[PDB]
């Protein structure tokens, strides 16, 4: 689900700052953006890797 | 569902040129970037209402 990993991408740039998570939720407008719905879901699973890690 | 969302108006935009639908589309990348996800979601069942409309 896109809506929980914008939710968490956001909350961690709010919180943090971070570079990578900014990163990664402006790849994902991108993808949204271009409607490369591949590359959406494979950016999706980094995302919540990354998330974990910092957890 | 954020992804069928812009689906439809990925389509829209891309099959008729339609500029409410870019202007929805932009809009509702903008709204994620800045992050308020309640109002994204409201802006983004005003895209489907547009896009139902259409037909």
């Known amino acids: ?3 929980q990993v914008f939710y968490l991408l956001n ?3 709010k919180r ?4 990578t998570c900014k990163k990664l ?3 994902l407008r ?3 953006k271009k409607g490369d719905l591949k590359a959406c879901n494979e950016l999706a699973d980094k ?3 990354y998330i974990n890690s910092l957890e």
Request: charged share 20%.
């Open 11 to 13: 909350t961690c740039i």
């Open 47 to 49: 995302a919540v890797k």
């Open 30 to 32: 991108e993808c949204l």
């Open 16 to 19: 943090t700052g971070d570079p």
């Open 1 to 3: 689900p896109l809506w």
């Open 25 to 27: 939720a402006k790849a």
